[PDB]
Write a protein that binds this ligand. Structure first.
Ligand SMILES: Cn1nc(C(=O)NC2CC2)c2cc(F)ccc21
Ligand SMILES: [Zn+2]
Length: 139
């Protein structure tokens, strides 16, 4: 579980969004596993604006932050789950690292700020949904 809080926006995994989220929906892309909802209070996270391929992510299933190298955001085939059938997920970055389903929402961060959230994994890989192209999150 987990979210990004930037300005009056809340970014979550689409597959974990709540009632208030859909109600206050700003934007969602099923192919990216992303949903942005409006917030009352102002958030304090900074979104990275960069092409970094190294960073640190939070793994709730280890209570540990791991340094990782990750691929640039791309179209990647993701095995069927309880949330989606087998499909190409867009804007997805892979690293070698441990993850389990319930780690989704864990932040990936570089020196420039928030890069993305845990979205996919299995076979010793962890996938992260990029948010760095979502320029409107900053205004
Ligand atoms: C981080 N992580 N996410 C998922 C997942 O099913 N994500 C759905 C596409 C949303 C997963 C499955 C695993 F077996 C191991 C790790 C995982
Ligand atoms: Zn960066």
């Amino acid at each position: 579980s987990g979210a990004i809080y930037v300005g009056n926006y809340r970014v979550v995994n689409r597959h974990l969004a709540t009632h208030n989220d859909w109600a206050n929906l700003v934007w969602e892309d099923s192919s990216r596993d992303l949903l942005v909802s409006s917030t009352t209070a102002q958030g304090c996270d900074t979104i990275a604006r960069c092409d970094c391929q190294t960073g640190v992510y939070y793994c709730s299933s280890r209570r540990k932050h791991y340094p990782v190298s990750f691929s640039k955001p791309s179209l990647i085939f993701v095995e069927a789950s309880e949330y989606y059938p087998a499909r190409y997920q867009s804007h997805l970055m892979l690293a070698v690292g441990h993850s389990e389903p319930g780690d989704c929402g864990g932040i990936l961060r570089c020196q420039h700020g928030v890069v993305g959230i845990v979205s996919t994994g299995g076979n010793g890989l962890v996938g992260f949904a990029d948010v760095r192209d979502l320029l409107w999150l900053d205004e």
